[PDB]
Ligand binder design. Sequence first.
Ligand code: UTP
Ligand code: BA
Ligand code: CL
Length: 484
Amino acid sequence: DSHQLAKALAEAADVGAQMIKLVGLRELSEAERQLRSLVVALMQEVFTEFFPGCVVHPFGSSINSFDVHGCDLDLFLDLTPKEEKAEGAAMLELVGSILRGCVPGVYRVQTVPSARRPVVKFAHRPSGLHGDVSLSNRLALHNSRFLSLCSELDGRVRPLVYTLRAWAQGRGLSGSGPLLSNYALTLLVIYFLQTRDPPVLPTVSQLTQKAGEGEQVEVDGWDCSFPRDASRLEPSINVEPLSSLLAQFFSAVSSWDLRGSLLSLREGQALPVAGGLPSNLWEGLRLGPLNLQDPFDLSHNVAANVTSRVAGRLQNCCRAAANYCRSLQYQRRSSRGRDWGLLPLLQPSSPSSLLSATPIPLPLAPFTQLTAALVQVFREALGCHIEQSASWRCALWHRVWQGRRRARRRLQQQTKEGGWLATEAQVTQELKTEPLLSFVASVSPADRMLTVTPLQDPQGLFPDLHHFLQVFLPQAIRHLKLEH
Ligand SMILES: O=c1ccn([C@@H]2O[C@H](COP(=O)(O)OP(=O)(O)OP(=O)(O)O)[C@@H](O)[C@H]2O)c(=O)[nH]1
Ligand SMILES: [Ba+2]
Ligand SMILES: [Cl-]
């Protein structure tokens, strides 16, 4: 791993071979699946001991075909409004005590009622496995099955999802908190496949319409019905190779309008967010920087946790990735030993690149006035020489991002013993023809955020400038807001 993987990808044919080989290397072995099966069997044994006729249904990465080594094990246990929450939480505690004290080998048991879907986190010691026990999740089962079904519908699915998933892990786009879940990212890939001119994957509404007799199922008032086998469905007429689909992915999601669009896997289409339509229809839908609808529960934005910085970082990383995929280093292999194809995409991100990818949130203000105030801050309040979404090229011959404290103290003392822009500009000018550091500033139409990328950085001081800008620019615009 990280060594064997690198040479394995570098050694093999074209890009598609790299993606396929990646899937081959990361996926769970037979022994791993045997181990997981046995552990789930034990859990089943103890839960049967407590709950006669209860079924333990594995879901998520286990059954959705996107599994990798050491992945979580998601288990679903199948057996007034605040009273119902309290009842559910108590029940969850009961399951938690069953895990904690009964089933042999399991430790690290933490009940999490506060989560969206309440869950009991567990670790099984002898197998070295960990995961979540869920009481109510029946939608995850069917949508996981839906994911594996997608994998069966077209052979390019697993390679795309695996590669893009690893890439997202690399670019810091995926994880907990504000980031994207692997499920959300997966839904994005699938939606991308549905939106190709020839469709690579059918829309979920098409699967629902196809369905079958007795294959009808309704969970939590939503229609989860899809065909059980991929044989009853006609293949894709899309001839696009893996690499082209990867590049097209990056370019696509880089060019999309995320804020103003709710991406529907059901209709296989982009539904306009503004104004008010989908949130009025399904009534449970949270809207934000990135909106991606679950194929079954239509009141659930799977990306609803994604902050503007994360969406911005996503589209930036995707634009950069597209730029790379247009280079010859991507398409053509290497003679001897050099990194080609998937390798720079799976390689760790440069600190300057990692920083530049994630934009800087700015206070609310009209685009024109915001831009004017920005270039006014760079020009006036900093030593920046600037020149002509919006963008400006900026040059700094000075250390201006650092040394401001001492200079401000000196000025404070000089003034003591004998309005923001002009004063801070004086602070800057009191800090003191080849450019020391040159960088690009960019503002997107929606949401309005400043993106700072490097150009010429001989001494490698760019990240310091980036952090300093992260602190300085918002408060500058903040003070400029109060002059009106
Ligand atoms: O918003 C969500 C998130 C997750 N889920 C359900 O939870 C399951 C967990 O989906 P994950 O986001 O955990 O991804 P994963 O398990 O496929 O991969 P790893 O995290 O193991 O790397 C998914 O398969 C989905 O069924 C939802 O239904 N909605
Ligand atoms: Ba998981
Ligand atoms: Cl597109």
